[PDB]
């Protein structure tokens, strides 16, 4: 047998992946189902996954001239911009006048 969509293989067992916003705390078995847990308030995981640790949210230092363009959710990281100010690097880790 081969695995269906949104599944992963572990010791010839097709387990369900974890939905976004949730990390893995237990692989499935022939008879139980994969055990996921929600990310933390400041944590996120954006894909169907079998990660064991969520990712931390981008922080937007106002010292570095940053405003929060979209707040962090559990399945999306924060999105940040500059505000008046104009961004230096293309990835936009910091801004300037």
């Amino acid at each position, epitope marked *: 047998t081969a695995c269906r969509e949104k599944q992963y293989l572990i010791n010839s067992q097709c387990c369900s992946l974890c939905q*976004p*916003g949730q990390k893995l705390v237990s692989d499935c078995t022939e008879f139980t189902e994969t055990e996921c847990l929600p990310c*933390g*308030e*400041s*944590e996120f995981l*954006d894909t169907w996954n079998r990660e064991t640790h969520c990712h*931390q*949210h981008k*922080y*937007c230092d*106002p010292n570095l001239g940053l*405003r*929060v*363009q*979209q*707040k962090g*959710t*559990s*399945e*999306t990281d924060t999105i940040c911009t500059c505000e008046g100010w104009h961004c230096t690097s293309e990835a936009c880790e910091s801004c300037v006048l």
Partner: antibody, heavy 116, light 114 residues
Framework: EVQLVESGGGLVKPGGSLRLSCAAS????????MNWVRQAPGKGLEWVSY????????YYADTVKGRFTISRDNAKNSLYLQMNSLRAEDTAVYYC?????????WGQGTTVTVSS | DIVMTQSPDSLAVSLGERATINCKSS????????????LTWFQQKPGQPPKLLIY???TRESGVPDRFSGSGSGTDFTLTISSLQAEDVAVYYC?????????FGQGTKLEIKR
């Protein structure tokens, strides 16, 4: 039950300072983001500041940038607002509100009056 | 800063009838990632803090009765209280939960006609 209990309000002279406290019970304080929100007598709600649950990231409303400072003591299950140089437009009821993507539990509020 | 503007400012509705409070935001509140609209409705009875009613524009908080209903998308949303009840008298606030600073609507005072 889940509880948030604000304290430390009162009467205060303009340009003077005041430190508010909020004592949490009934939930994993360390897990939630904590917020301060105020409501001036007669007016609507104003979100004042936020402090995250992870690496304790902090955001502020511009109208208190530079004057208020938010902090938490997870060991003590306490949230704090140190308010400095209070102008009289700061007179309001200050609400303690936990968040996990929305303010689902609020305190009863404490009153702060910035008066001559 | 996003600006939440509510309409009507004041509304009187008889018991049993349907109340309609509207909210418009200056930005969109759609998170294109999880496809959720980050609008939140609160009820504030007097002497009490606001009480969360509905988040993600349509998802009802636990314990909120089915007669409370959230609808809308993008920049225009609606809180519809059908089968209005004596204890529904409060001020209702919509709230930008999309980014910082988090901004509320200005209020809608609902009266009960009796």
């Amino acid at each position: 039950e889940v509880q948030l209990v604000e304290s430390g309000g009162g009467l205060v002279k303009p340009g003077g300072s005041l430190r508010l406290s909020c004592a949490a019970s009934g939930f994993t304080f360390s897990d939630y983001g904590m917020n301060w929100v105020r409501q001036a007598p007669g007016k609507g709600l104003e979100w004042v500041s936020y402090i995250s649950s992870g690496r304790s990231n902090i955001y502020y409303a511009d109208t208190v940038k530079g004057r208020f400072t938010i902090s938490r003591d997870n060991a003590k299950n306490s949230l704090y607002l140190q308010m400095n140089s209070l102008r009289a437009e700061d007179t309001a009821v200050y609400y303690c509100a936990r968040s996990w993507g929305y303010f689902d539990v609020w305190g009863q509020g404490t009153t702060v009056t910035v008066s001559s | 800063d996003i600006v939440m503007t509510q309409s009507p400012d004041s509304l009187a509705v008889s018991l049993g009838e349907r109340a309609t409070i509207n909210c418009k935001s200056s930005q969109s509140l759609l998170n294109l990632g999880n496809q959720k609209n980050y609008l939140t409705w609160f009820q504030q009875k007097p002497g009490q803090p606001p009480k969360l009613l509905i988040y993600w524009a349509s998802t009802r908080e636990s314990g909120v009765p089915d007669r409370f209903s959230g609808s809308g998308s993008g920049t225009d949303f609606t809180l519809t209280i059908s089968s209005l009840q004596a204890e529904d008298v409060a001020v209702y606030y919509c709230q930008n939960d999309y980014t910082y600073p988090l901004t509320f609507g200005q209020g809608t005072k609902l009266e009960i006609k009796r």
